[PDB]
Design a protein around this ligand. Structure first.
Ligand code: HEM
Ligand code: HEM
Ligand code: HEM
Ligand code: HEM
Lengths: 145, 139, 139, 145
């Protein structure tokens, strides 16, 4: 991860004005709708039968908060993405058996909820800064396979 | 696959982009060249700096093939076979690259249409650009 | 895409596996369960230990759908739509998994047919199992 | 990388009876035929117009030797796949711009040339030992993105 100074202030500044709780529940929300094989991994969240069922579902929102707080960690400790995510990488490998391709997929869901959310402030410059982080956060969760 | 719901979701969307398709396709490219600079390699022959005139021309051309496809939703190999020999045969574009441009196209639409860019819509749209990506790499 | 060369390369191959298809499909599965144990998850309900009787039964069933496809090479959505709702809709099998089984199927054929498993052949075969994978995940 | 003792003797024993020079030229050979977009990356090897052109081609064979000797390193230094491949990962990223998915693809070509080559000795047990190595060797070359 590079993350230059003007590339650093774009991230923490634009992250400034998103509600993290909704970014998380909505990204997790969208992922399951756009990629329905991801529902199998979350068999424990009740039914997920339609676009509605998987959006009012309190358990999806709840999980997507635990997701966003870890992502918030990412930002705090960009020195060591791998250290921060050592435990969680182990979890998603030894006990969940999630193919790493699924990480960049969710990464992308955060990427476009941010754009959906922030409007014409999610400039190509802003996006790129976020790309490198979500990319960094993705291979962080993969280094234990 | 594309249901009747997918077919009609698409047409509303391209009904709404109207004549912005051109400047959208520009933005999507500009977004790809920065978030995924690996792609810049395929365009060594043109100026590519953020705001630009050759990026603008290619931009419009892209969104036209998107307009075309949306029209011939049911005959995508048919409608876009001339762009198949260009990418698959002539240029040898990596099949991973189409996932980067399709994504940046979604970030573009999502940015410009918060009201319309719902989950239900967004899946059809992804799915759509996946078969547009598929046919594009079909050879 | 599948050229006439691809169509006929396939039919020779399935012409040569004859009635080994069954034990081949077994071997391919046995090969998948070991090189990619992530897959074992999808078969929690059966015995899966190296040599086995339920792995043998599923094995044959697989190679039948491969025989079927090779016959209806030109109507793959048609020939295999009943295996689409099984995998895509009922089981929610990851689309990455089909790349692991297709590979193990190639290691199986390559092992048993050194004479026939040439480069030219092997591309058609890969390409074939890619559209068999595609249709399988088509929903 | 796990690589147990009986999983270690399967690798160095079966690698015992392959000609590395041909495994390398043939895996590189097959990759370009089965995945033709990989030819763009190797623009410098003459024409690659057909299955023949890309198999008698001395430059393909030559490159596939340099590939196999690095793979041989992998085997010697399974303690540190990442250290061994630090330089080469940098090369394939900063100067070649190769999408990491292409690594597991070539990995696979070695995987089945081995099977094609060794016959009914490439047992499911043998394959798995080789999977983990070629997998290990693949994310080794990816850790600099
Ligand atoms: C994008 C990066 C990801 C982050 C930051 C993340 C974060 C987390 C965290 C923090 C937990 C533990 C919750 C707790 O401590 O209470 C968790 C659990 C879990 N994650 Fe992820 N995750 C990511 C990717 C994924 C993906 C793509 C999947 C889809 C397969 C997934 C599937 C699961 C499952 C099945 C659980 C446990 C189930 C449960 O809590 O009921 N994760 N995740
Ligand atoms: C799936 C969405 C895409 C569409 C609809 C599309 C469509 C087009 C169109 C309309 C043209 C110009 C037609 C012509 O002048 O012959 C073109 C050219 C080209 N495309 Fe794309 N394309 C897509 C994806 C991509 C991707 C992902 C790449 C790789 C980054 C790519 C690389 C190129 C190149 C290198 C040219 C020629 C450049 C030039 O005009 O000098 N295309 N494409
Ligand atoms: C592309 C090659 C494949 C073919 C031709 C194929 C075909 C079949 C056939 C013929 C059946 C049994 C039909 C029935 O009893 O209804 C079946 C069942 C099943 N398949 Fe596959 N399949 C393929 C790939 C996969 C993959 C990659 C997975 C995931 C590892 C998978 C998971 C399953 C499961 C879980 C069942 C039901 C198990 C049972 O019989 O109790 N399939 N498939
Ligand atoms: C499977 C793991 C791989 C290994 C072990 C490997 C090995 C090597 C080595 C050792 C060199 C430098 C040769 C020298 O020092 O003279 C090299 C160069 C190169 N590799 Fe790879 N490589 C791998 C994957 C790939 C893949 C998948 C591609 C396809 C995009 C690729 C494309 C290239 C290119 C374009 C060069 C330089 C071109 C040239 O030498 O003329 N590599 N590789």
């Amino acid at each position: 991860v590079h993350l230059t100074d003007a590339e650093k202030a774009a991230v923490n500044g634009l992250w400034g004005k998103v509600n993290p709780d909704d970014v998380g529940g909505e990204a997790l929300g969208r992922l399951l709708v756009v990629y329905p094989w991801t529902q199998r991994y979350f068999d424990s969240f009740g039914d997920l039968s339609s676009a509605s069922a998987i959006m009012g579902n309190p358990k999806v929102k709840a999980h997507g908060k635990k997701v966003i707080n870890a992502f918030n960690d990412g930002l705090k400790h960009l020195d060591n993405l791998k250290g921060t995510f050592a435990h969680l990488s182990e979890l998603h490998c030894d006990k969940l058996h999630v193919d790493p391709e699924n990480f960049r997929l969710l990464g992308n869901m955060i990427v476009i909820v941010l754009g959906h959310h922030l409007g014409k402030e999610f400039t190509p410059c802003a996006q790129a800064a976020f790309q490198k982080v979500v990319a960094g956060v993705a291979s962080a969760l993969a280094h234990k396979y | 696959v594309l249901s009747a719901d997918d077919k009609t979701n698409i047409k509303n969307c391209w009904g709404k982009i109207g004549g912005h398709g051109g400047e959208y396709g520009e933005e999507a490219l500009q977004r790809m060249f920065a978030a995924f600079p690996t792609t810049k390699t395929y365009f060594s022959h043109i100026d590519v700096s953020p705001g630009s005139a050759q990026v603008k021309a290619h931009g419009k051309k892209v969104a036209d093939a998107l307009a075309k496809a949306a029209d011939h939703v049911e005959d995508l190999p048919g409608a876009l076979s001339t762009l198949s020999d260009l990418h698959a045969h002539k240029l040898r574009v990596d099949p991973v690259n189409f996932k980067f441009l399709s994504h940046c196209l979604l970030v573009t639409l999502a940015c410009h249409h918060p009201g319309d860019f719902t989950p239900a819509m967004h899946a059809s749209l992804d799915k759509f650009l996946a078969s547009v990506s598929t046919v594009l790499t079909s050879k």
